[PDB]
């Protein structure tokens, strides 16, 4: 098919986490932030050409929780299988010393949608300006997620993306320099 | 500690503008699809035994079958018309450089994914030697792709990186 629109929701227990997003050919259109009760467009410009009523999303998530609890009981409390991520670490653009850039940590093919992702610079945790997407859907019903780290490229800096997930026995750590 | 996950997906598949529209309603417990509405079928289907009760409710709910059947129009064709006003035809031209790593063609910042990236040498395009990462999603509505050419460093000859992407009828070219 030429194009695909996907509305993807989840609720998860005992974590009590839920997300609501729209997807076009594998990129996020928007999500609803559950804390802020707000439609967050993936790029702000999109909100000039479209609108979405956040309150509907929240209602769907309350109903998804209820539907989860019914399926938990009907399944005789069969738990979700932990499927561990795979990870890639790469720069957003062609890298040039001292011209700001963004390091991308892409995490793929995991369930459930819970990650502890840590950026390290020369062995030490860094957080300045970090951003992330929502849990992006896959056809196989596993998840994807992007983490962004603003950096100023140098000769001597080494970066590690460290991911923790219940599907891994030990952390999955990759680097770029 | 055990986890429990429920996923809902509403999919709209489009071909030839909106001549071919397929609506899918997926109910997914612990990553497995239990029950589906597929508008090509036009009835709900219990994919697993766990979905039969949930299929009975759906199928017994007052006007729900007709509402699912009308979703190709009320939801899919509706949402497409909104997205055709900015998303469906978004184009970002690629950014092209060459640099020594072996010779590297960096193609950055382009949408949509379909792209033709060729290595030329003194005017002729070679096929053997070329190694590609393939299409790399950036997650911000851009892709990148590094196309490398294992190359013998011999003075005299110009290597061109030729990039044809829908964003321009005309290619983006970088000599070395």
């Amino acid at each position: 098919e030429d194009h695909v629109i996907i509305q993807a929701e989840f609720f998860m227990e005992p974590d009590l986490t839920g997300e609501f997003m729209f997807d076009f050919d594998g990129d996020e259109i928007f999500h609803v932030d559950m804390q802020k009760k707000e439609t967050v467009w993936r790029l702000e410009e999109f909100g000039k050409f479209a609108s979405f009523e956040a309150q509907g999303a929240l209602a769907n998530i309350a109903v998804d929780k209820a539907n989860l609890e019914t399926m938990m009981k009907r399944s005789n409390y069969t738990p979700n299988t932990n499927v561990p991520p795979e990870m890639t670490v790469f720069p957003n653009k062609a890298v040039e010393l001292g011209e700001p850039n963004i390091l991308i940590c892409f995490i793929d093919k995991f369930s459930p949608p819970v990650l502890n992702v840590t950026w390290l610079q020369n062995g030490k945790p860094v957080t300045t300006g970090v951003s992330e997407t929502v849990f992006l859907p896959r056809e196989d019903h596993l998840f994807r997620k992007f983490y962004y780290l603003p950096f100023l490229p140098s000769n001597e800096d080494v970066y590690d993306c460290k991911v923790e997930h219940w599907g891994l026995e030990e952390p999955l750590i990759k680097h770029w320099e | 500690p055990a986890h429990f996950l429920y996923q809902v997906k509403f999919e709209c598949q489009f071909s030839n503008g909106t001549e071919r529209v397929r609506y899918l309603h997926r109910s997914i417990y612990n990553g497995q699809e239990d029950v589906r509405f597929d508008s090509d079928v036009g009835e709900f289907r219990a994919l697993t035994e766990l979905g039969r009760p949930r299929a009975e409710y759906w199928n017994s709910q007052k006007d729900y079958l007709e509402d699912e059947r009308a979703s190709v129009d009320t939801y899919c064709r509706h949402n497409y018309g909104v997205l055709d006003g900015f998303l469906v035809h978004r184009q970002t031209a690629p950014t092209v450089t060459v640099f020594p790593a072996l010779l590297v063609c960096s193609v950055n910042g382009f949408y949509p994914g379909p792209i033709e990236v060729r290595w030329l040498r003194d005017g002729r395009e070679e096929q053997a030697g070329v190694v590609s990462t393939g299409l790399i999603r950036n997650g911000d509505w851009t892709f990148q792709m590094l196309v490398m050419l294992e190359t013998v460093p011999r003075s005299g000859e110009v290597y061109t990186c030729h990039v044809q992407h829908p964003s321009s009828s005309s290619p983006v070219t970088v000599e070395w």
Partner: peptide, 12 residues
């Protein structure tokens, strides 16, 4: 011009 969502039938 509104993106519409659909609701998963609630089990109450």
């Amino acid at each position: 011009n509104d993106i519409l969502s659909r609701l998963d039938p609630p089990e109450a």
